[PDB]
């Protein structure tokens, strides 16, 4: 809601799910006999379909294949020779 509603996780510009959410609201607003199953089943529908949509956002907005093996090559070290050159310079000055 901060950055932009074209990226939004639910989808409400590009997609027409937010009117299905409005229908979901109409049915569950004035239900007399309150229950627990009726509350929790539609917490699936607002989440699962919605939850792949931010996923197809950040694959093509920030890498999801790139960055999580790359940030480990810097921490768990997957560039040993290119970091041996460091250990040589750092021996002589971490005494």
């Amino acid at each position: 809601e901060n950055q932009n509603v074209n990226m939004s996780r639910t989808g409400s510009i590009l997609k027409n799910q937010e009117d299905t959410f409005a229908a979901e609201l109409h049915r569950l607003k004035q239900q007399p006999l309150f229950s627990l199953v009726d509350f929790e089943s539609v917490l699936d529908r607002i989440r699962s379909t919605v939850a792949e949509h931010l996923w197809k956002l950040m694959v093509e907005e920030s890498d999801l294949l790139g960055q999580l093996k790359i940030i480990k090559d810097f921490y768990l070290l997957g560039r040993g020779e290119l970091f041996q050159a460091f250990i040589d310079v750092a021996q002589n000055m971490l005494k």
């Binding site: 009117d19 409005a22 609201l25 109409h26 607003k29």
Partner: protein
Amino acid sequence: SESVTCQSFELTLRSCLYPHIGKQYLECCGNL
């Protein structure tokens, strides 16, 4: 009808009016 498709409720009506201001605010800044 019923207002229950709108939520909640008057600040949603102001945040449609904030793009009404935009279409005049971006288009004045174009002639500048």
